[PDB]
Design a protein around this ligand. Structure first.
Ligand code: HEC
Length: 92
């Protein structure tokens, strides 16, 4: 079961909410929209764990790109999984 407080704590600590809201878009997509994009995908969790631990290109609204925030080695595997699992749940 997702630990919601631990997920939101990890997000705060790693600047995630500076660019993402739960329901409101900012620099990055809302997590509700992400959850919708990935709803049902069998490999959703692995894909988002990959996304947050690789630093691949992230295209911004104004057209510029940056390597995405990479938290590999900055928290535990269990904490990262729990944060992904929280995100994926936010479609409802
Ligand atoms: C602003 C500087 C950002 C910070 C800090 C973080 N994210 Fe981000 N993220 C951002 C952008 C601009 C995008 C869109 C990239 C694109 O090319 O479309 C994203 C995307 C995500 C996603 C969706 C990935 C996908 O496969 O659809 C997730 C789940 C996500 N970002 C999570 C996330 C987390 C957990 C962060 C803190 C560790 C974080 N982001 C920081 C911009 C920014």
């Amino acid at each position: 079961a997702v630990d919601v407080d631990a997920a939101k704590s990890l997000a705060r600590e790693n600047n995630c909410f500076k660019c993402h809201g739960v329901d409101k878009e900012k620099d990055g997509p809302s997590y509700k929209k992400v959850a919708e994009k990935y709803r049902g995908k069998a490999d959703a969790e692995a894909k988002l764990i990959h996304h947050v631990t690789s630093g691949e290109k992230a295209k911004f609204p104004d057209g510029h790109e940056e390597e995405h925030k990479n938290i590999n080695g900055k928290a535990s595997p269990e904490a990262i999984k729990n944060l992904v699992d929280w995100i994926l749940s936010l479609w409802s």
